[PDB]
Swiss-Prot record, chains A, B:
Transmembrane segments: none annotated. Belongs to the herpesviridae major capsid protein family. Disulfide bonds: none annotated. Signal peptide: none annotated. This is Major capsid protein. It comes from the Viruses. It comes from Epstein-Barr virus (strain B95-8). The chain holds residues 297 to 346 of 1381 of the full protein. Self-assembles to form an icosahedral capsid with a T=16 symmetry, about 200 nm in diameter, and consisting of 150 hexons and 12 pentons (total of 162 capsomers). Hexons form the edges and faces of the capsid and are each composed of six MCP molecules. In contrast, one penton is found at each of the 12 vertices. Eleven of the pentons are MCP pentamers, while the last vertex is occupied by the portal complex. Homomultimer. Makes the hexons and eleven out of twelve pentons. Interacts with triplex proteins 1/TRX1 and 2/TRX2; adjacent capsomers are linked together in groups of three by triplexes, heterotrimeric complexes composed of one molecule of TRX1 and two molecules of TRX2. Interacts with scaffold protein; this interaction allows efficient MCP transport to the host nucleus. Interacts with capsid vertex component 2/CVC2. Interacts with the small capsomere-interacting protein/SCP.
Amino acid sequence: EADNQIMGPSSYASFVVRGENLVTAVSYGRVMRTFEHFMARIVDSPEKAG
Amino acid sequence: EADNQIMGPSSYASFVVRGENLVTAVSYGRVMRTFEHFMARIVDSPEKAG
């Protein structure tokens, strides 16, 4: 065998419906994942290419 | 005539789609008027009865 062990993530990641996502939930029923990424993509410099 | 004139507003109001309103407009295709009110009701202190 090449390696005996592998390094892995110790804990789960956290998806919590925070404040800015919750307003979409109660109103439209469509919460989204990583809303702050959407704000940074189409509000804070949308002309910056991905 | 009790009045010759009435005092009123001078300009129209401005309903401009700001940033998080653009985000929900782009993603879910629905804008809510005064998003800061929805954020100050459903997120910041919902225990205060309207």
